[PDB]
Amino acid sequence: GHMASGLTIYFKKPDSWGTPHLYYYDTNPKVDEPTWSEAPEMEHYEGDWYTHTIEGVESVRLLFKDRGTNQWPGPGEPGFFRDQDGWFDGEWHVDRPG
Q1: CB 66 within 8 A of CB 60
Q2: Which domain of life is it from (predicted)?
Q3: Centroid of chain to Cα 14
Q4: What is the DSSP letter of 78?
């Protein structure tokens, strides 16, 4: 068959945040998972939207963070579970809000 598949996630970065990164763990199927500090950069998409695709995954647990001390959630919170692509602005949407 075949194409590049997985979980695409778009993040509307808060303006106070520095460069956005995507931290994710318990992947399924199991795939190399990043360090908290080695989390992939979220490439700029448009406006305050940033994006990143985890290849090969059907579900993941995720948090957004910057290269400083910001994150969402939310110190003491577990990751967001996903399962599906991918637009977060404070709420999850499957397609771009608007």
Answers
A1: no
A2: Bacteria
A3: 14
A4: P
Resolution reached, in Å? 2.0
Cα 5 to Cα 14, 54, 55, 56, 77: the distances in Å are: 28, 8, 6, 6, 28
Give which of 16, 20, 28, 7 is closest to 84, Cα–Cα: 7
Instruction: Name the residue range of residue 16's domain.
Output: 1-98
Strand 86-88 to 6-12 pairing: parallel
Residues 62 and 8: beta-carbon distance below 8 Å: no
- Judging by beta carbons within 10 Å of its beta carbon (0-12, 13-18, 19+), is residue 42 exposed, middle or buried? buried
- If one counts the domains in the chain, the total is 1
